[PDB]
């Protein structure tokens, strides 16, 4: 949250998912946009 | 007996710059002469703009800005409108005529 | 605007309100109807000293300068200290 | 504010004299400061400066046309006078009377034309 502008990066690695991968993966840009709010916390949601 | 030369055409989108440029020969007309500029709208008389390559009369506005450096002059245009189409001139003095001498006349279109 | 907000046989369509206990703030809206109150009595109700809030706005084609239905839109632009959302159609040139 | 108002024929069979005058109100001739001149241009062409011309009678002058035009001034009727001879095909343009070539203070190469005629179409024919 750098000067406000909400800044969002992903990628979705295939490797499986046994366990936390070793090899490098970037991250792409996917959205940045001028959210204006300061954040500090955080949580997630779930699903039914 | 075009001892200036200009760009026949010039074209530019409008609010954006654009740069006329007129220089002469070395024999003719030299460092210490100076260059006007000229407006005509078609079928009008021609407008002065700058005289002096850095000044301009009362109602020029102050978007059309000139320089001359050595020989060679130019005119900056900022922010094109669509009434500033027109034939625009350069002209100034030639020692070896000693008459004044006028550009070919450049074509300004608004885009 | 008289092609849209006139007919024949008259339109009264549009209200518009001529008392109120008060002037109004910038930028408010004051949705009622209240009867304005003439002395010291209560009364709801129309007639004298009970006046309905709002009037008419009765459009015909045929009015003076003054009385046509001119449509107004007015622009309010917050130009302060905030991330930029809405700005002018930037000009494009060719390429060359 | 100073207006020009020149007139002539707009059609000269060729081969002789060609003659039109420029008119100066709200101001007068006999200003001695600034100068005045005759600046012709083709259709299709630039700017082509013809001579200019002092109260007194002495004239500027373009080599090029010497043997062909003469410029007369009078200061009683404020009138600015061009006279062209042996006009061609070539000379198919609009004049304009211009004041320009301030004489008391700027010299002779910073001279900027300064007002202009409304103009006249002026063409030969046969
Ligand atoms: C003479 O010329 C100078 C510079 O060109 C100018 O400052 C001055 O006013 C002129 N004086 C007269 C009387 O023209």
Redo the contacts between chains.
């Keep these: 949250n750098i000067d406000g502008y909400f800044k969002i990066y992903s990628k979705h690695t295939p490797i499986i998912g046994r366990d936390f991968p070793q090899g490098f993966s970037a991250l792409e840009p996917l959205v940045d946009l001028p959210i204006g709010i300061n954040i500090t916390r955080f949580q997630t949601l779930l699903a039914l | 007996q075009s001892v200036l030369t200009q760009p026949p055409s010039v074209s530019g989108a409008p609010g954006q710059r654009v740069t006329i440029s007129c220089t002469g020969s070395s024999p003719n007309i030299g460092a210490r002469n100076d260059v006007h500029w000229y407006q005509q709208l078609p079928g009008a008389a021609p407008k002065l703009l700058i005289y002096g390559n850095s000044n301009r009369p009362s109602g020029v506005p102050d978007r059309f800005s000139g320089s001359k450096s050595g020989t060679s002059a130019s005119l900056a245009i900022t922010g094109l409108q669509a009434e500033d189409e027109a034939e625009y001139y350069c002209q100034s003095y030639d020692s070896s005529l000693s008459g004044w001498v006028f550009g070919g006349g450049t074509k300004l279109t608004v885009l | 605007s008289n092609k849209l907000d006139s007919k024949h046989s008259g339109n009264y369509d549009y209200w518009y309100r001529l008392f109120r206990k008060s002037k109004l703030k910038p930028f408010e809206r004051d949705i009622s109807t209240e009867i304005y109150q003439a002395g010291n009595k209560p009364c709801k109700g129309k007639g004298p000293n009970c006046y309905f809030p709002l009037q008419s706005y009765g459009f015909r084609p045929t009015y003076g300068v003054g009385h046509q239905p001119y449509r107004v839109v007015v622009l309010s632009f917050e130009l302060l200290h905030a991330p930029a959302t809405v700005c002018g159609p930037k000009k494009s040139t060719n390429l060359v | 504010q100073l207006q020009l108002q020149e007139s002539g024929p707009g059609l000269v069979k060729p081969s002789e004299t060609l003659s039109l005058t420029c008119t100066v109100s709200n101001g007068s001739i006999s200003s001695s400061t600034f100068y005045w001149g005759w600046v012709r241009q083709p259709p299709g062409?630039?700017?082509?400066?013809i001579g200019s011309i002092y109260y007194s009678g002495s004239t500027?002058?373009?080599?090029?046309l010497k043997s062909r035009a003469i410029i007369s001034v009078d200061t009683s009727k404020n009138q600015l006078s061009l006279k062209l001879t042996s006009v061609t095909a070539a000379d198919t343009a609009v004049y304009?009377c211009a004041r320009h070539w301030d004489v008391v203070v700027l010299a002779?190469?910073?001279?900027?034309?300064?007002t202009?005629?409304?103009?006249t179409l002026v063409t030969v024919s046969s």
């Design positions: 062409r630039g700017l082509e400066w500027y002058q373009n080599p090029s304009y002779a190469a910073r001279s900027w034309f300064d202009w005629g409304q103009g």
